[PDB]
Write a protein that binds this DNA or RNA. Structure first.
Ligand SMILES: Nc1ncnc2c1ncn2[C@@H]1O[C@H](COP(=O)(O)OP(=O)(O)OP(=O)(O)O)[C@@H](O)[C@H]1O
Ligand SMILES: [Ca+2]
Ligand SMILES: [Ca+2]
Ligand SMILES: [Ca+2]
Ligand SMILES: [Ca+2]
Length: 901
DNA sequence: TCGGTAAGCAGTCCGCG
DNA sequence: GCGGACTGCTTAC
């Protein structure tokens, strides 16, 4: 095979590399890499190296990396630019792997582990590491085995061995329901003492050294606890054996309010799954416990134990260890579904970076742009210091709050990257400036044509049209990857909807699901075959369709993120190619494009409808427009559509055959006006929305900017079997909103949009009546808890103390002097509940860590003093009042002249 | 929470005769 | 009461 890297480090004057050699085997080598940097030189000189602007450079080959680093200092000490890749291991991979890397994942050791540590005096701090490690479970992806390290003798209790037989039995037999499909993959190793447990673990680790290391909170807990514990018992040299090069750095992570501590293991790439999740999932959750995320992702039951976790190993060692194993499996199931390790490997080997650098868009694009320039013998600039300046963003239209009944939305494809491509925006493509007119003069096509030579943005910047810049060239490659996986996703979704329709009439037989590729639209034959399946086979197909869709969503949405980060990074002072001229050229172009096409759509529709100056575009945000289509439905007449699906088909065909052409002509003209390099403003129909035909539903409504709901029948070509609510910005979309209230508000919206006023009023009444019976956790608010210290005055709230922090302070006083009860952690999330005064907590609210029950000695007093009335008015009624004044409806039935006789 | 802007709403404080 | 200035948070793009 072609060789590929696994991990790379700089250590002193050596690069340390682990790699897969051409025979498929893992190897390590130390290289005395001799780096190269570049200095500008006079035109009259014999060279083949040029900086990105075409000025010649001379290569300076150094005896070692430290020399190169000292040269860089000396060049600043003089006041001259030191060009070229100053991260010497990126330089090493570009030289060592001068081709597109094909990797074989089956040869990369992905390890995912978790540990257990028993602790009578509260949360066991990884830097203290003063309590025994009594369980480790370590899954190895090359062996496909779960290795279980179990301490039977501790100062906190001696125990019997874990039983693999009791572990397999149902929880109803008294077992632990460890899933059948991993039972035969468990290699169980019990130990007499913690010393030997750790020595075997490190001996194991050295035979199977992880390349990728993941888990849940491995970076903030498991890894530092193991390192420090081994350090405390055996000394530092022994702990360092967690690194294959025997070097580790105790690095400090800063933020705006504090400094946590993590351990860097050289020659290993830590991708802690909690962070992979936060970056790539595109969710915001009320809690990031494993229990909680597992339930959300896999619908598996939470792992139940009685007593506190500090007594678990003592009360029920059997379950202790079983739950440790399942925890490890649960991350593997989440990854099987979401596929974030795959994505990370893909992204890492494409950029040619340390795999763990996928969390850094700046680092990823620095390496992509560098290798692209290097292959043309071009030399990247030095990074410079910049003060952080604010700059302008997108345009968002102010909507008239209202119900809106028939809506078609349109949206530009991958806007910021298409603008970059269309305009040719890149550091070295900058041709000059022209004298700007006010933006509206460009929107309304009255301003002077900015150039007849260069390609322009309405911020004043001009750009070369002869050749593509490195930024458009590289952004296009990744755009086309994104576009490919987006097709697999939409096809999987469309096929999803075909399986749902068929579930309405499932055949009575026994059979199995077809072996098909859900990434492609089902053929006529598969559609006939599906019509003859059992409900059980159809449901398995659906699950599979829905797993395929998720897989594509992961791979498409995060390529979208990566290319959109490039546009963003042009406005980050730590990016090598930072330039507000370019950042603002992108955003200002986007503002113009939205309002330009809004004007053209309105002109078009006023011409098709015979009117003058009537607004059809009701809203827009950044790159999208929503268009009222009432006047369009009305011109054929509500009464001539056979059913809902007939007017949707009508609007669809109108959107595709009348409006899309008109939009393209409108954008074609704007490209010509700005004299751009390539027309790439492709605005397709996104959503077609309305109430069910012959219903009293209102279809949709806007309350303000970034706050609306629509009843959608079709979305980017996916025709729903049942209409789908597209709710943006409203409280049903916020993680802060109690789960029970999110659900109730949604149903109220469903009834507004599909069924109308009377139904809304039916539901509201019942919710109000019954809501005192809801679980307290389903009706708590949630919030991030920052700077708890800033507002802590002797245990009482200081000035401007936010509500949720008052709740945390109340909590702290209530659990005073309990080493055992849960503390709220700075930076993490809490549940919040109002208290009726005058209660025994002495304040109007209480908060506790999200994802948990509140400790038992206060749960009764909280449940008893909970202020359900305040709670219903803040979270449910107030938002609902918002929606209904917007939609022109009443949530309570108002008196009329029709009673009482 | 280590790794772009625009803009909503909850809440504090405090004016508004 | 509710608006404005402000902080905190969380969403849409
Ligand atoms: N998460 C983000 N980070 C940075 N910029 C973003 C992000 N989301 C959107 N933008 C900016 O707003 C523009 C419009 O966003 P939108 O959500 O319509 O996606 P898009 O890039 O147009 O891709 P598509 O519409 O094809 O999914 C983007 O091109 C850019
Ligand atoms: Ca655990
Ligand atoms: Ca878009
Ligand atoms: Ca059937
Ligand atoms: Ca959009």
């Amino acid at each position: 095979m072609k060789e590929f890297y696994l991990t790379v480090e700089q250590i002193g004057d050596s690069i340390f590399e682990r790699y897969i050699d051409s025979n498929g085997r893992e190897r390590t080598r130390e290289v005395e890499y001799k780096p190269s940097l570049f200095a500008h030189c006079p035109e009259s000189q014999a060279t083949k190296y040029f900086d990105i602007y075409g000025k010649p450079c001379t290569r300076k080959l150094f005896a070692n990396m430290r020399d190169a680093s000292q040269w860089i200092k000396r060049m600043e000490d003089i006041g001259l630019e030191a060009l070229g890749m100053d991260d010497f291991k990126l330089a090493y991979l570009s030289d060592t792997y001068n081709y597109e890397i094909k990797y074989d994942h089956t040869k990369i050791r992905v390890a995912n582990f978790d540990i257990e540590v028993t602790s009578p005096d509260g949360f066991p701090e990884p830097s203290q590491a003063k309590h025994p490690i009594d369980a480790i479970t370590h899954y190895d992806s090359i062996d496909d085995r779960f290795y279980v390290f179990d301490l039977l003798n501790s100062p906190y209790g001696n125990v019997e061995e874990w039983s693999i037989e009791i572990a397999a039995k149902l929880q109803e037999q008294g077992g632990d329901e460890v899933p059948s499909e991993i039972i035969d993959k468990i290699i169980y190793m019990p130990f007499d003492n913690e010393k030997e447990l750790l020595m075997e673990y490190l001996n194991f680790w050295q035979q199977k050294t992880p390349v990728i290391l993941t888990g849940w909170n491995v970076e903030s807990f498991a890894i530092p606890y193991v390192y420090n514990r081994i350090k405390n018992i055996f000394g530092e040299s022994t702990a360092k054996r967690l690194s294959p090069h025997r070097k580790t750095r105790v690095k400090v992570i800063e933020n705006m309010y504090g400094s946590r501590e993590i351990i860097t293991l050289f020659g290993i790439s830590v991708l802690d799954y909690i962070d992979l999740y936060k970056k790539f999932s595109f969710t915001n959750q009320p809690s990031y416990s494993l229990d909680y995320i597992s339930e959300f992702e896999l619908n598996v039951g939470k792992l139940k134990y009685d007593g506190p976790i500090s007594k678990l190993r003592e009360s029920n060692h059997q379950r202790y260890i079983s739950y440790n194993i399942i925890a490890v499996y649960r991350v593997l199931q989440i990854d099987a579904k979401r596929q974030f390790i795959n994505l990370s490997l893909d992204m890492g080997y494409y950029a040619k970076i340390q795999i763990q650098s996928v969390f850094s868009p700046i680092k990823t694009w620095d390496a992509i742009i560098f290798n692209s320039l290097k292959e043309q013998n071009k030399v990247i600039p030095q990074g410079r210091s910049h003060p952080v300046q604010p700059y302008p963003g997108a345009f968002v239209k102010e909507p008239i709050p209202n119900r809106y009944k028939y809506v078609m939305s349109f949206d530009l494809t991958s806007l910021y990257p298409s603008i970059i491509r269309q305009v040719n925006i890149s550091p070295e493509t900058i041709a000059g400036t022209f004298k700007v007119a006010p933006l509206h003069d460009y929107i309304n096509a009255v301003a002077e044509r900015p150039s007849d030579v260069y390609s322009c943005s309405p911020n004043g910047m001009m750009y070369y049209k002869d050749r593509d810049g490195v930024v458009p060239t590289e952004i296009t490659k990744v755009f086309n990857q994104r576009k490919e996986h987006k097709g697999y996703m939409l096809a999987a979704q469309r096929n999803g909807e075909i399986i749902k329709e068929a579930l309405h009439n499932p055949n009575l037989s026994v059979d199995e699901p077809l072996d098909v590729d859900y990434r492609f639209d089902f053929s006529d034959e598969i559609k006939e075959k599906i019509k003859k399946l059992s409900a059980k086979s159809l449901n398995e197909m659906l699950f599979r369709a829905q797993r395929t869709e998720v897989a594509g969503m992961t791979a498409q949405i995060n390529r979208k993120l990566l290319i959109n980060s490039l546009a963003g990074a042009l406005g980050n002072v730590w990016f090598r190619y930072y330039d507000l001229r370019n950042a603002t050229a992108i955003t200002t172009f986007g503002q113009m494009a939205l309002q330009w096409i809004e004007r053209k759509v309105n002109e078009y529709l006023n011409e098709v409808c015979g009117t003058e100056g009537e607004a059809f575009v009701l809203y827009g945000d950044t790159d999208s427009i929503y268009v009222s289509a009432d006047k369009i439905i009305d011109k054929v007449g509500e009464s001539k559509f056979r059913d809902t699906n007939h007017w949707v088909d009508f609007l669809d065909k109108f959107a595709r055959e009348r409006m899309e052409p008109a939009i393209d002509r409108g954008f074609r003209e704007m490209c010509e006006y700005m004299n751009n390099k390539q027309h790439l403003m492709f605005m397709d129909r996104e959503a077609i929305a309305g109430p069910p035909l012959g219903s009293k539903g209102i279809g949709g409504f806007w309350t303000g900017k970034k706050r609306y709901a629509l009843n959608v029948w079709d979305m980017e070509g996916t025709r729903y079997a049942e209409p789908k609510l597209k709710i943006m910005g409203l409280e049903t979309q916020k993680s802060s909103t109690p789960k029970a209230v999110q659900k109730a508000l949604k149903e109220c919206i469903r009834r507004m949009l599909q069924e109308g006023e009377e139904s809304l009023q039916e539901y509201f009444k019942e919710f109000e009546k019954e809501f005192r019976q809801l679980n307290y956790i389903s009706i708590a608010s949630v919030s991030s808890a920052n700077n708890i210290a800033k507002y802590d005055v002797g245990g009482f709230p200081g000035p401007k103390c936010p509500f949720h922090i008052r709740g945390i302070l109340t909590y702290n006083r209530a659990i005073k002097g309990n080493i055992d009860a849960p503390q709220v952690v700075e930076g993490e999330k809490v549940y919040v509940l109002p208290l009726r005064e005058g209660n025994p907590f002495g304040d109007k609210c209480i908060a506790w860590p999200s994802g948990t029950e509140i400790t038992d000695l206060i749960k009764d007093d909280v449940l008893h003093w909970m202020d359900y009335t305040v709670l219903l008015e803040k979270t449910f009624i107030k938002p609902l009042e918002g929606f209904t004044s917007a939609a022109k409806l009443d949530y309570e039935k108002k008196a009329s002249l029709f009673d009482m006789f």
